[PDB]
Tab-separated table of N, CA and C in Angstrom:
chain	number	residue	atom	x	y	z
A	1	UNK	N	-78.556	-10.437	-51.085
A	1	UNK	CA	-79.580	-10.653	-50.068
A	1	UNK	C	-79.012	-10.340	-48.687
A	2	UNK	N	-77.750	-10.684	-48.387
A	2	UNK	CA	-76.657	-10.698	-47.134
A	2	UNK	C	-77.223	-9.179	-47.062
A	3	UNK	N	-76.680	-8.168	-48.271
A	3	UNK	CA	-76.422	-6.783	-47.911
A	3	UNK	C	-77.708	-6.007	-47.342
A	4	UNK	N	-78.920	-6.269	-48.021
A	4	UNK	CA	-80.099	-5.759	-47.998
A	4	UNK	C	-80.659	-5.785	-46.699
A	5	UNK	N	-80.481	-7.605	-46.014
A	5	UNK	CA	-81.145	-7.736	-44.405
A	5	UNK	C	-80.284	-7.040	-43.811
A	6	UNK	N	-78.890	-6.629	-43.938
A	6	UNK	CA	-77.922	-5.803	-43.315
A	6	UNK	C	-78.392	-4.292	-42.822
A	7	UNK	N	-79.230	-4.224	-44.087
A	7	UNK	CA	-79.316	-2.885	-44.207
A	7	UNK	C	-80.706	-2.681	-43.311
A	8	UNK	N	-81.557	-2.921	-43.575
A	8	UNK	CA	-82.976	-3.273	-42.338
A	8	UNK	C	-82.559	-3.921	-41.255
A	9	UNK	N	-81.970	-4.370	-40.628
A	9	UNK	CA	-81.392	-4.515	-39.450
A	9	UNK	C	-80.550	-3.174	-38.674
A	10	UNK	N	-80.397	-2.360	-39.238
A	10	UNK	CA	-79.094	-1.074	-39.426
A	10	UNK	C	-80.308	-0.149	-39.022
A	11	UNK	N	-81.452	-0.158	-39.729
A	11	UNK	CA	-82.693	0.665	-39.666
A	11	UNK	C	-83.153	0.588	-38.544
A	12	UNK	N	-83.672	-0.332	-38.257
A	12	UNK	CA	-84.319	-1.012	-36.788
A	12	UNK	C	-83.419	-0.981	-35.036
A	13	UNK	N	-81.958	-0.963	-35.939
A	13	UNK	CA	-81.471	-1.036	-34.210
A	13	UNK	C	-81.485	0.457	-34.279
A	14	UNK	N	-80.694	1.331	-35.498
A	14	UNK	CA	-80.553	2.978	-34.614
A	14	UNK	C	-82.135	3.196	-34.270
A	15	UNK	N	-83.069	2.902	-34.769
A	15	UNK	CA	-84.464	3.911	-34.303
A	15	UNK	C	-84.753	2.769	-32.848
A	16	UNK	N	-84.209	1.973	-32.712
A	16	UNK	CA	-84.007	1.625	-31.324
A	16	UNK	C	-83.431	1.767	-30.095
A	17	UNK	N	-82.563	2.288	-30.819
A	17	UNK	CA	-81.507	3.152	-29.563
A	17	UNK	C	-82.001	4.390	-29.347
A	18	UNK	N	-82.487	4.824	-30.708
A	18	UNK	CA	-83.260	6.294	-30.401
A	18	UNK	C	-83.675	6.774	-29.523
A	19	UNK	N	-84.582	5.564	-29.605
A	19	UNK	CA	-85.837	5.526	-28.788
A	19	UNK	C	-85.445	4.723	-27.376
A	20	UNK	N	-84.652	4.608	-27.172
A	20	UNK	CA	-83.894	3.943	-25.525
A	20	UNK	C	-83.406	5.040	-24.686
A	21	UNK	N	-82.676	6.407	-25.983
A	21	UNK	CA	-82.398	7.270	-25.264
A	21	UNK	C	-83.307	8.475	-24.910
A	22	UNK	N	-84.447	8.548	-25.655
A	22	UNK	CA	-85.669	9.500	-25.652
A	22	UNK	C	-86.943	9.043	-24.495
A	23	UNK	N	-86.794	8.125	-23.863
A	23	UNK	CA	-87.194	6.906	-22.957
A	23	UNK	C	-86.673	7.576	-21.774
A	24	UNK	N	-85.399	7.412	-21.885
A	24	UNK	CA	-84.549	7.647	-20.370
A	24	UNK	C	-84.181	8.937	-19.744
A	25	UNK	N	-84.612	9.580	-21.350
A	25	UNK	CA	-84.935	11.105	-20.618
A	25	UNK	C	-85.811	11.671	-20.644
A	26	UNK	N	-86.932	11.281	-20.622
A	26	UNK	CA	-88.508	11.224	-20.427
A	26	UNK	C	-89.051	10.913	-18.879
A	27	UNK	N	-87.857	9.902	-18.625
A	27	UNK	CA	-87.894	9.267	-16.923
A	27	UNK	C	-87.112	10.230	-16.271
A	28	UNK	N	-86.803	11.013	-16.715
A	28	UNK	CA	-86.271	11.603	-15.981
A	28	UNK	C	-86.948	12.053	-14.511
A	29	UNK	N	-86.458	12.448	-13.051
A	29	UNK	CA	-87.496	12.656	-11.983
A	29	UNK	C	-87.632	14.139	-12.182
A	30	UNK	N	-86.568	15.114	-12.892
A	30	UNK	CA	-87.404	16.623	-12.553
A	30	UNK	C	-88.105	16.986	-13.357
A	31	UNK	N	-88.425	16.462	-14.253
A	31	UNK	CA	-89.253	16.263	-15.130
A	31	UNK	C	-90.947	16.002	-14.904
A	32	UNK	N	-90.877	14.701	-14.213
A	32	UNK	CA	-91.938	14.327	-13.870
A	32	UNK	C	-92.796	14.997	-13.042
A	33	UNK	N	-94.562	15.835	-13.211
A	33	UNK	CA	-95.252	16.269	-12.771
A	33	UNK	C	-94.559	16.247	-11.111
A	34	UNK	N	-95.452	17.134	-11.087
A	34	UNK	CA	-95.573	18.065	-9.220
A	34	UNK	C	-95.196	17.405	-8.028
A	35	UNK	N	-94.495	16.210	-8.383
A	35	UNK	CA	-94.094	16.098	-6.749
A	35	UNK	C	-94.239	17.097	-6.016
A	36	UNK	N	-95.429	16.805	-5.276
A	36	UNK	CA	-95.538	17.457	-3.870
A	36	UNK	C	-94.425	18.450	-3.726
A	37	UNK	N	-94.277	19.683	-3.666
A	37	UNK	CA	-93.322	20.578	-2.853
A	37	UNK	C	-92.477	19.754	-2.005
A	38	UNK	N	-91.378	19.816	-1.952
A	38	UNK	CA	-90.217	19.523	-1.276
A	38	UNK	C	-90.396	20.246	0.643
A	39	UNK	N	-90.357	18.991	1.534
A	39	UNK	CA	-90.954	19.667	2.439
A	39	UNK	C	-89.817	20.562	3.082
A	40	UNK	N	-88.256	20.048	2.616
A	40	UNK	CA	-87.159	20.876	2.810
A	40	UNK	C	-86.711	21.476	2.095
A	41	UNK	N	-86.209	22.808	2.235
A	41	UNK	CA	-85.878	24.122	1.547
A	41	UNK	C	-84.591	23.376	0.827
A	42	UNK	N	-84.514	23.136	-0.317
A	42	UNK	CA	-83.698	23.019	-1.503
A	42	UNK	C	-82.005	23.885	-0.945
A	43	UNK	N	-80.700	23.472	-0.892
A	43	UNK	CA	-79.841	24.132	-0.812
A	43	UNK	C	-79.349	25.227	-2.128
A	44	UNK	N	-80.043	24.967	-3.232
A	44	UNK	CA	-80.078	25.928	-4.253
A	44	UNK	C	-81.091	26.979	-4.047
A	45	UNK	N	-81.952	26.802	-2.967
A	45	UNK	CA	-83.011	27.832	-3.018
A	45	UNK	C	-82.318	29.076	-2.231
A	46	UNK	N	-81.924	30.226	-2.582
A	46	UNK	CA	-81.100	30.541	-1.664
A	46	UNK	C	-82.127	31.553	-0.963
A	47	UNK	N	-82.656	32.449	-1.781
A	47	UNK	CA	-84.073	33.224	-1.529
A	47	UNK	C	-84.427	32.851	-0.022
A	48	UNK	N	-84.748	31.610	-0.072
A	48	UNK	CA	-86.111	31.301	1.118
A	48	UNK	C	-84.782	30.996	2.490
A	49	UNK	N	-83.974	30.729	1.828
A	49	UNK	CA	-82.586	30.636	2.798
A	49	UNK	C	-82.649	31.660	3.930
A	50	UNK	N	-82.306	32.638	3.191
A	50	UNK	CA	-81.659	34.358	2.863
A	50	UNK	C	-83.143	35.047	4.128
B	1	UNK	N	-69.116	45.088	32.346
B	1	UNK	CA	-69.072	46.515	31.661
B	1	UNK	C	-67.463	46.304	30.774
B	2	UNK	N	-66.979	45.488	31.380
B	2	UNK	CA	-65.796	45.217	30.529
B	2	UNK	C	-66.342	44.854	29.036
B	3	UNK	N	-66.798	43.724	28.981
B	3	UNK	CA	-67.347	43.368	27.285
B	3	UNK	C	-67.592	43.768	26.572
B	4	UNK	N	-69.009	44.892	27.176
B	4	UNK	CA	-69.891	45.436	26.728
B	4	UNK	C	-68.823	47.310	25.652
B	5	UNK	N	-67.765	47.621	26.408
B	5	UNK	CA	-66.988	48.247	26.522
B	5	UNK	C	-65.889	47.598	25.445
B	6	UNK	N	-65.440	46.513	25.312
B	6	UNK	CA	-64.715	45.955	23.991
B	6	UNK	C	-65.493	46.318	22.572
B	7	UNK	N	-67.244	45.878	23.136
B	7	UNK	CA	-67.707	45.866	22.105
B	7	UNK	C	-67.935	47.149	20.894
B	8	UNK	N	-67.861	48.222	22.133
B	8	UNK	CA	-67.806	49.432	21.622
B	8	UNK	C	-67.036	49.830	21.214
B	9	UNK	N	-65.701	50.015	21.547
B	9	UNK	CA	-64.893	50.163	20.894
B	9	UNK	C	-64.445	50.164	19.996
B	10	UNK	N	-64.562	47.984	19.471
B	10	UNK	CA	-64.338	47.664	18.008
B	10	UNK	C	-65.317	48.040	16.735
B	11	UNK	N	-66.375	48.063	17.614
B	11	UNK	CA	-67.424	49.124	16.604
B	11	UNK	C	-66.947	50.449	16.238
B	12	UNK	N	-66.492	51.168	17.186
B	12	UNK	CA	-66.225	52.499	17.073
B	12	UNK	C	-65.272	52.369	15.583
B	13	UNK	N	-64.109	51.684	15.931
B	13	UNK	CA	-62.678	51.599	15.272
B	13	UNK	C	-63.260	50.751	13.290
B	14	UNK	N	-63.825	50.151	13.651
B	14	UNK	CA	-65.220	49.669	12.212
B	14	UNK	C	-65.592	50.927	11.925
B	15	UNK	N	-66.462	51.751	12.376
B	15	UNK	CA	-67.483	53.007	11.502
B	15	UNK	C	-66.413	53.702	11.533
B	16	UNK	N	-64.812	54.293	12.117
B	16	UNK	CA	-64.556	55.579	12.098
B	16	UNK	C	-63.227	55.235	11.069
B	17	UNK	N	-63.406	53.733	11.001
B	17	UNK	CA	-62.391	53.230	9.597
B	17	UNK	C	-60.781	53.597	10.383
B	18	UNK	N	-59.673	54.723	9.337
B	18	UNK	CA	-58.356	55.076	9.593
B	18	UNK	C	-58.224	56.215	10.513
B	19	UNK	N	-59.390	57.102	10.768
B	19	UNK	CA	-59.547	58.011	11.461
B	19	UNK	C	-59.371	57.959	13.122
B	20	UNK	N	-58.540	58.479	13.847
B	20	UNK	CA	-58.357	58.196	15.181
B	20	UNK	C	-59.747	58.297	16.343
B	21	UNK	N	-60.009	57.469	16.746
B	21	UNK	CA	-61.382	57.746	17.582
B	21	UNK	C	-61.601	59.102	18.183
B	22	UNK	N	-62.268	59.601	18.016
B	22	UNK	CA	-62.856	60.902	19.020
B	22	UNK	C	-62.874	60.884	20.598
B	23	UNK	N	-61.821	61.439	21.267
B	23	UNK	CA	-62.147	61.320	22.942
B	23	UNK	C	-63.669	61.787	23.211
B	24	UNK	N	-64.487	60.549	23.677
B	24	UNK	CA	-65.387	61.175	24.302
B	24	UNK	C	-65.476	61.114	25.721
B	25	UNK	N	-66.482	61.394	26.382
B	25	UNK	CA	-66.601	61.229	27.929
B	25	UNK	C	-67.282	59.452	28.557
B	26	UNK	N	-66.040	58.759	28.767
B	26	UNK	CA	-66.445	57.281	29.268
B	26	UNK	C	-67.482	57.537	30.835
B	27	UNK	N	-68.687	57.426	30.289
B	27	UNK	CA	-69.359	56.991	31.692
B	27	UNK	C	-70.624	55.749	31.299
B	28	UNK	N	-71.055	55.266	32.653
B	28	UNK	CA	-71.981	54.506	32.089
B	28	UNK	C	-73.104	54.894	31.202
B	29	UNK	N	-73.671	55.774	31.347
B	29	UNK	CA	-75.041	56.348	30.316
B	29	UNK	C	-74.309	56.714	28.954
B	30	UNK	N	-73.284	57.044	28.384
B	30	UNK	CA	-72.622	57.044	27.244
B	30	UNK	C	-72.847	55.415	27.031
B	31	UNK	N	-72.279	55.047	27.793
B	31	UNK	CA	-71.473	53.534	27.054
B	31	UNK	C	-73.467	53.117	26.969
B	32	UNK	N	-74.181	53.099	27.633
B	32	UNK	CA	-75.327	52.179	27.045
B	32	UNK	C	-75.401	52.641	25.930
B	33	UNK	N	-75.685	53.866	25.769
B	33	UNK	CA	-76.082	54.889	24.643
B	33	UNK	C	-75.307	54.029	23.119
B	34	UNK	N	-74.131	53.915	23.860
B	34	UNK	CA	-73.619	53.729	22.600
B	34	UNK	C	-73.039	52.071	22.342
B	35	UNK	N	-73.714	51.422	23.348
B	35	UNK	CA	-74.058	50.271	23.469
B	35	UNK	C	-75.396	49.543	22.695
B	36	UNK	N	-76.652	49.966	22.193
B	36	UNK	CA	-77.901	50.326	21.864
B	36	UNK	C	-77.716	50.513	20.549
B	37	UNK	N	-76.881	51.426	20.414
B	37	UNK	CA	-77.041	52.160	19.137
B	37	UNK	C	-75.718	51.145	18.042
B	38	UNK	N	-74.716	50.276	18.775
B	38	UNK	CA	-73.837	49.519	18.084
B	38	UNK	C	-74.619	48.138	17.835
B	39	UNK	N	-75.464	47.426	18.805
B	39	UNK	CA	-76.294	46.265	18.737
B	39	UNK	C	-77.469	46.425	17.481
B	40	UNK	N	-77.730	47.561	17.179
B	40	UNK	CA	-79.030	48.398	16.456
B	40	UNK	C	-78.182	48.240	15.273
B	41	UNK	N	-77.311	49.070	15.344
B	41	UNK	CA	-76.168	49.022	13.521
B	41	UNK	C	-76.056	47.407	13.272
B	42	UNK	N	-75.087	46.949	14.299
B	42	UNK	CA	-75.119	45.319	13.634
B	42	UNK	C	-76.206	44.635	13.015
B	43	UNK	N	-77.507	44.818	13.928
B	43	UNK	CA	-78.513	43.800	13.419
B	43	UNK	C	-78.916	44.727	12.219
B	44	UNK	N	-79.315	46.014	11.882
B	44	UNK	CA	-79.565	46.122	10.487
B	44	UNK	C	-78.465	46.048	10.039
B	45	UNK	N	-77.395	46.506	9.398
B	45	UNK	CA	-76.567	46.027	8.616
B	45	UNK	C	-76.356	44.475	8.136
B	46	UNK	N	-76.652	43.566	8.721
B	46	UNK	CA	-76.623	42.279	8.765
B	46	UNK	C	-78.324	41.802	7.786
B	47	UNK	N	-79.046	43.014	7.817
B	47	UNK	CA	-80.288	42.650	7.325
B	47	UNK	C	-80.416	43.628	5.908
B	48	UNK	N	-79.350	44.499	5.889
B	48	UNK	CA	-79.334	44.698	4.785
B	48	UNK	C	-78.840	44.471	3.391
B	49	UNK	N	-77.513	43.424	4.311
B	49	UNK	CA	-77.513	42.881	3.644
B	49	UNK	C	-77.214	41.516	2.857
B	50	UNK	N	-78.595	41.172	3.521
B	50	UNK	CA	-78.940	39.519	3.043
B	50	UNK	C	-80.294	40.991	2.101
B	51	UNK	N	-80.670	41.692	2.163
B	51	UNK	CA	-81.737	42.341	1.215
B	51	UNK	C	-80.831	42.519	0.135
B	52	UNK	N	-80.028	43.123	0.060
B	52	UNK	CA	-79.098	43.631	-1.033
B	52	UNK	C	-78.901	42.307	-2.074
B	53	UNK	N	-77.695	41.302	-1.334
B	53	UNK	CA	-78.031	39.979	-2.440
B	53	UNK	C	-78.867	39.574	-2.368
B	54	UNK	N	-79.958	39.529	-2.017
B	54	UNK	CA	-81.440	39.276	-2.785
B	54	UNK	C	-82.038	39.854	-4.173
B	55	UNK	N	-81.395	41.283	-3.356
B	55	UNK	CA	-82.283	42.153	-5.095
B	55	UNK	C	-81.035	41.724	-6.366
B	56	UNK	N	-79.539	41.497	-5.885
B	56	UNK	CA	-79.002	40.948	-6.967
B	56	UNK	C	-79.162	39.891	-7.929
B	57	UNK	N	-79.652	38.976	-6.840
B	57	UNK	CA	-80.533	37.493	-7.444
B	57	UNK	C	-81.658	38.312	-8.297
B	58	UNK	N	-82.521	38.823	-7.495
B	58	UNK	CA	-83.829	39.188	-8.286
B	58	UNK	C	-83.469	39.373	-9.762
């Protein structure tokens, strides 16, 4: 009985962590829809620099 | 006319590279002439190339 709840407990935390790390990169900010244009020219933008 | 007269020069000694400058005739209507025409090279060259690494990016 010890081994079995072992084993469903084992189930439940990895698809929990899974899902902690599929979460946190979901939040990610460049990710997230259109923030408004950046009202300052990006130092990677070199184009609009240039 | 002193400056203006450095400036030419080091331009000259830039475009004519290892080659010894050409005596020409120093007067004022030369030196604008070629005062005009060194201010003119700098600013395009300088615009050609920020175009150039551009089209490399592109």
């Amino acid at each position: 009985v010890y081994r079995e709840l072992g084993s469903i407990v084992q189930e439940l935390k990895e698809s929990g962590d899974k899902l902690e790390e599929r979460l946190t990169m979901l939040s990610d900010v460049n990710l997230l829809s259109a923030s408004k244009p950046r009202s300052n020219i990006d130092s990677k933008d070199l184009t609009s620099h240039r | 006319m002193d400056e203006k007269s450095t400036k030419i020069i080091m331009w000259l000694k830039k475009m004519f590279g290892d080659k010894p400058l050409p005596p020409y005739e120093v007067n004022t209507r030369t030196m604008e002439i070629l005062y005009q025409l060194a201010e003119w090279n700098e600013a395009r060259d300088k615009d050609l190339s920020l175009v150039t690494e551009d089209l490399k990016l592109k």
